[PDB]
Amino acid sequence: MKCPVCHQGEMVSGIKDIPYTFRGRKTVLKGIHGLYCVHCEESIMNKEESDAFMAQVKAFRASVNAE
Ligand SMILES: [Zn+2]
């Protein structure tokens, strides 16, 4: 499929480590499955992929808020 954001790159199946900063705290969200644009790096995650990703995101946010 063509990337729905940059309209030139192709979407490919992959696993990526995703940097994230929340309330000034920096982390890398490891091993996130999804489709990724080879050109602009836009991600497309289906329901199951989104659930896994957001579990990581929310665990990180919770830890930051409690610290
Ligand atoms: Zn793209």
Numbering used by the authors: 1 to 67
Question: What does the literature reporting this entry say, word for word?
Answer:
Our biochemical and structural analysis of the E. coli MqsA antitoxin and the MqsR:MqsA-N complex provide a detailed 3-dimensional structural view of the free antitoxin and the TA complex. These structures combined with our biochemical data unequivocally demonstrate that MqsR, a protein previously shown to be critical for biofilm formation and the most highly upregulated gene in persister cells in E. coli, and MqsA form a novel bacterial TA system. Our data show that, as expected for a TA system, the expression of the MqsR toxin leads to growth arrest, while co-expression with its antitoxin, MqsA, rescues the growth arrest phenotype. In addition, MqsR associates with MqsA to form a tight, non-toxic complex and both MqsA alone and the MqsR:MqsA2:MqsR complex bind and regulate the mqsR promoter. MqsA itself is a two-domain protein with a novel fold that, unlike every other antitoxin, is well-ordered throughout its entire sequence and whose structure does not change upon toxin binding.
MqsA-N binds zinc and adopts a novel, elongated fold. It is composed of one long five-turn α-helix, a twisted β-sheet, loops that connect the secondary structural elements and a coordinated zinc ion. The zinc, which serves a structural and not catalytic role, is coordinated by four cysteines (Cys3, Cys6, Cys37, Cys40) with an average sulfur-zinc distance of 2.35 Å. In spite of the low sequence identity (12% identity, 18% similarity) in the MqsA-N domain among different species, these zinc-coordinated cysteines are perfectly conserved, suggesting that all bacterial MqsA proteins adopt a similar fold. The interaction between the two, long twisted β-strands and the five turn α-helix of the MqsA zinc binding domain is stabilized by an extended hydrophobic core composed of 11 residues: Ile18, Tyr20, Phe22, Leu29, Ile32, Tyr36, Met45, Phe53, Val57, Phe60 and Val64 (residues in beige). The DALI server was used to identify proteins with similar folds. Although more than 269 hits were obtained (Z-scores from 3.2 to 2.0), they aligned to only the two long β-strands and the five turn α-helix; none had the combination of strands, helix and the zinc binding pocket observed in MqsA. Thus, to the best of our knowledge, MqsA-N is a zinc binding domain with a novel fold, hereafter referred to as the MqsA fold. MqsA is also the first antitoxin described that requires a metal, zinc, for structural stability. In contrast, no shift is observed when the DNA is incubated with either MqsA-N alone or the MqsR:MqsA-N complex.
